[PDB]
Write a protein that binds this ligand. Structure first.
Ligand code: 7FH
Ligand code: ZN
Length: 257
């Protein structure tokens, strides 16, 4: 099945998922000089005070921190969005080395990792119906650089030993995703896609300009996870990022001057 290796990595995905070579695929390189300021954009509204985390899951491609999305508890609105998007899960993409790992790049610069907070448009009722729509999702993307530790990340790093291999989950209640946000909500936005199969073109991407800093020890612990299941040859979960895809007929808009 798909993955990130030589034989089943991103350059292969198009054979099972032809939309891989579609018109609005993600990630992309953000050319900062050509992203135009759009003064009609709104401040993003991130309302996470009532977020209810439930569980953390190693799905064989990344780990997901899952939320109860049965009510309007943790929502994203404003910015480029019409309506209200509900948080369902977050996950990361990261490298085997600090020099790589993010999916979006900024003037071709790769960060050590990239956090994706996935939200679905509540007008569609649930996640599975939202991914049938071109405005079904909004993904808040936040870059990670290695430097100072991020205290708000440590509860995630500390649970990873309990979900080392594919298919493992752990209770993961009362985690506050506000602790993963940088100071500034200045962002770039463009229409794109999921960055793993099935690569659906549902996503309004909102990528924050300000990275968060995480420590070398925090990211080292992400790299001890495994893509394989228990009892299988160990294959470290590293380099689970898709490279930048052609921008095609898209414009990236900046919320800031
Ligand atoms: O790529 N991708 C995939 C998913 C899911 F959950 F549908 F698998 C959600 C968000 C993103 S970015
Ligand atoms: Zn992702």
């Amino acid at each position: 099945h798909w993955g990130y290796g030589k034989h089943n990595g991103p350059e292969h995905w198009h054979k099972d998922f032809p939309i891989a070579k579609g018109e609005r695929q993600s990630p992309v390189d953000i050319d900062t000089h050509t992203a135009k300021y759009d003064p009609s954009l709104k401040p993003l509204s991130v309302s996470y005070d009532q977020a209810t985390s439930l569980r953390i899951l190693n799905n064989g491609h990344a780990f997901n921190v899952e939320f109860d999305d049965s009510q309007d508890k943790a929502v994203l609105k404003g910015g480029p969005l019409d309506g209200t998007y509900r948080l369902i899960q977050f996950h990361f993409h990261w490298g085997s080395l600090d020099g790589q790992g993010s999916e979006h790049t900024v003037d071709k610069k790769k960060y050590a990792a990239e956090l994706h907070l996935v939200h679905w448009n509540t007008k569609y009722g649930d996640f599975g119906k939202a991914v049938q729509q071109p405005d079904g999702l909004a993904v808040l993307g936040i870059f990670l650089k290695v430097g100072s530790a991020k205290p708000g990340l440590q509860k995630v790093v500390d649970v990873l030993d309990s979900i080392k291999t594919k298919g493992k989950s752990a209770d993961f209640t009362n985690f506050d995703p506000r602790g993963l946000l940088p100071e500034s909500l200045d962002y770039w936005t463009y229409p794109g896609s999921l960055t793993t199969p099935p690569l659906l073109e549902c996503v309004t991407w909102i990528v924050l300009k300000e990275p968060i800093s995480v420590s070398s020890e925090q990211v080292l612990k992400f790299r001890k996870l495994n893509f394989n299941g228990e009892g299988e040859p160990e294959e470290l979960m590293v380099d689970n990022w898709r490279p930048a895809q052609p921008l095609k007929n898209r414009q990236i808009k900046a919320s800031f001057k």
